[PDB]
Ligand binder design. Structure first.
Ligand SMILES: O=C(Nc1c[nH]nc1-c1[nH]c2cc(C[NH+]3CCOCC3)ccc2[nH+]1)NC1CC1
Length: 254
């Protein structure tokens, strides 16, 4: 359907091993989007092409206010092009470096928005897995948008991965709830609960669910994060309960 000659490329929005994402405008529509440029070259090299065509599937047949749209794709000789929705306010990663740490009302909100996106996703047996600040964009309304369904799956950094995944075990859609716990702690505190200097120490730390809270993290936050960060998937709340949690509700603007 689409082709490069249909677009006007603007400023780089960022990088990544496989190439860059650019702001871009569809010539005859004047529609603003983001062009994710991926070299076939490198996708083959690091054997991810099977992953890529899965990112396209899942994220394409997905439709949610809190999930970055993928409109389409195309290729030529040197590379593969993803036509992404453009999220005007950058990544939550950047906002977090910017503010270093969020407040309960902002955190609340993101968690909600996030919960909803994952609620919708699981319904379709889609499990994200790779939910980290770097992967969360912001709409003009300032609202969260889960990006990058690269690792995404049906039916590198350890920081966001739950015990089950890391240990090489049975994992379902509970992963995404552990992830939410980690996120939730990172937003309030400014670093993820299992941060360490080595792969090896992080592994232990996650493995044994060793986290502590700074004093300023309030009781309700401790509660929700404590319930989310369970070694055992079965004890992790359902998304519904996260939405229903009283620290969420007390604070979640959106
Ligand atoms: O796919 C990506 N990003 C995007 C996909 N869709 N939209 C983006 C995106 N939106 C952005 C918005 C901003 C807004 N800032 C621009 C500079 O001044 C401050 C505000 C920045 C980067 C964005 N990437 N990857 C890039 C992080 C490496």
């Amino acid at each position: 359907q689409w082709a490069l000659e249909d677009f006007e490329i603007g400023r780089p929005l960022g990088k990544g091993k496989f190439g860059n994402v650019y702001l871009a405008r569809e010539k005859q529509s004047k529609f603003i989007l983001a062009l994710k440029v991926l070299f076939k070259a490198q996708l083959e090299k690091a054997g991810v092409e099977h992953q890529l065509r899965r990112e396209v599937e899942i994220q394409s047949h997905l439709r949610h206010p809190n999930i970055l749209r993928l409109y389409g794709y195309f290729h030529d000789a040197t590379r593969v092009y993803l036509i992404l929705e453009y999220a005007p306010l950058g990544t939550v990663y950047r906002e977090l470096q910017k503010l270093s740490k969020f407040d309960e009302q902002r955190t609340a909100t993101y968690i909600t928005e996030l919960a909803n996106a994952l609620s919708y996703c699981h319904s379709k047996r889609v499990i994200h897995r790779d939910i980290k600040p770097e992967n969360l964009l912001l709409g003009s309304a300032g609202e969260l948008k889960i990006a990058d369904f690269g690792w995404s799956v049906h039916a590198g950094t350890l920081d966001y991965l739950p015990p089950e995944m890391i240990e090489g075990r049975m994992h379902d859609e509970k992963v995404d709830l552990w992830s939410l716990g980690v996120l939730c702690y990172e937003f309030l505190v400014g670093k993820p609960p299992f941060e360490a200097n080595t792969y090896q120490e992080t592994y232990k730390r996650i493995s044994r669910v060793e986290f502590t809270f700074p004093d300023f993290v309030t009781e309700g936050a401790r509660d929700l994060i404590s319930r989310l960060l369970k070694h055992n998937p079965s004890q992790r709340p359902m998304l519904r309960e996260v939405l229903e949690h009283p620290w969420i509700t007390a604070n979640s603007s959106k």
